[model samples]
Target: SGAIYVGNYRVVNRHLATHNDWANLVWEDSSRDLLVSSTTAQGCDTIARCDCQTGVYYCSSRRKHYPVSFSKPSLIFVEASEYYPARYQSHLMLAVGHSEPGDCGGILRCQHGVVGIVSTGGNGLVGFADVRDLLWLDEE
Candidate 1:
């Protein structure tokens, strides 16, 4: 929520291209790898407490929202790539795949990036309309 070094670890682009086209995990294991669930909200795989913020996001589902960071490879971030520069500056979403879980296959884990390493989870979502605003929320 302060100074952000958006070198290779920032969020950007529409229909985000690849793992190279998004922000990576910026830090260590601070935030618990959001308890991913099959709970659907109008078609979205809900992540507990995820909310929108001004240059980023924060959550408090378990009352645990804070300024989190992403790196340059693991996560590709896209807010609103519908305009010249972008659209909603806070609305965000990403993708990730591969053997993320212990050994389970399919969309068991929403890893990081935009296009995802494998075609599963948020990474598999190609169109922006996939999640219908994965980061859809107003400030509280």
Candidate 2:
């Protein structure tokens, strides 16, 4: 309802949706044109799209692109079972080997498509909220 800021961008009017463990923040068209590669609501309309099946994760951070792999199968179950297992039903479990602070809210992609948004990192793992479900989220 009020102005929000992500890094250096000052966004006044936008839609911020939170589903489960991840959140989606829609920036102003003008701000997006300056920051996002695509103008469409779904950001991965180009050949850069990645598949979730690949098990490799890509994220562009601080203007540089980097790749990280899924840590292991059921990593979230192993690490977060004590706290948030139920919150990660539709998320991907990835390793936090190359992740850094301030990586939260960053987009995580794979060869299949835009996979999810980086949610959290700890104890050798990072969590991504599968955007496949977030895409269907209603603005209201």
Candidate 3:
């Protein structure tokens, strides 16, 4: 299959963040959202799809292993932090609480819509990959 499977979902397309210009913006693609469960009774949690790429990550769950989704408690996003650069080249930082170091490909949703993807995390914060960078295979 050309798609990457994650639990009850399959990623039909993929894109890695190479630039940071699209961070903190809305992605208008309607077909990119991956459905995990039929019921929204879970109150819309955060889902992630992880695989070791580029450098290397030592997550106990190996390649294409989907981690359990997180029901984040309405986390905070600190835009005025001196600790983070005003301009990010690749990953967008958010104070969205703790995620594992190797928790890549995590989807960040806001306002009842998809916002970003988790690329890296540390110090109780997560760096998300811009949602605009992703590509959908079906669109072609």
**Model 2 Cα shift for residue 51 (angstroms):** 6.7
How far out, in Å, is residue 45 in model 3? 13
Worst 10 residues of 3 by lDDT: 33-42
- Which numbered prediction scores highest in TM-score against the true structure? 2
Error of 3 at 114 (Å): 1.8
Clashing pairs in 3: none
Model 3: per-residue Cα lDDT over 6-118, one tens digit each = 22333321233222313322232222222111221223332222221221112322333232233222223334232233333332434435556345554544433344555
Candidate 3: misplaced stretches above 4 Å? Answer: 1-88, 133-138
lDDT of each: 0.22, 0.38, 0.34
Model 2 scores worst on lDDT over the 10 consecutive residues at 30-39
Badly placed stretches (over 4 Å) of model 2 are 1-51, 55-63, 71-90, 134-140
Answer with 2 or 3, whichever has the higher lDDT: 2
Quote model 3's TM-score.
Answer: 0.34
Q: In angstroms, how far off is 110's CA in candidate 2? A: 2.0
How do the candidates rank by TM-score, highest first? 2, 3, 1
Residue-wise C-alpha lDDT for candidate 2, range 1-140, written one tens digit per residue: 11212232222211232241123333223211111111122321212233444444433334445576653223243233332344423234565544443455455556654454455565556565444433322222
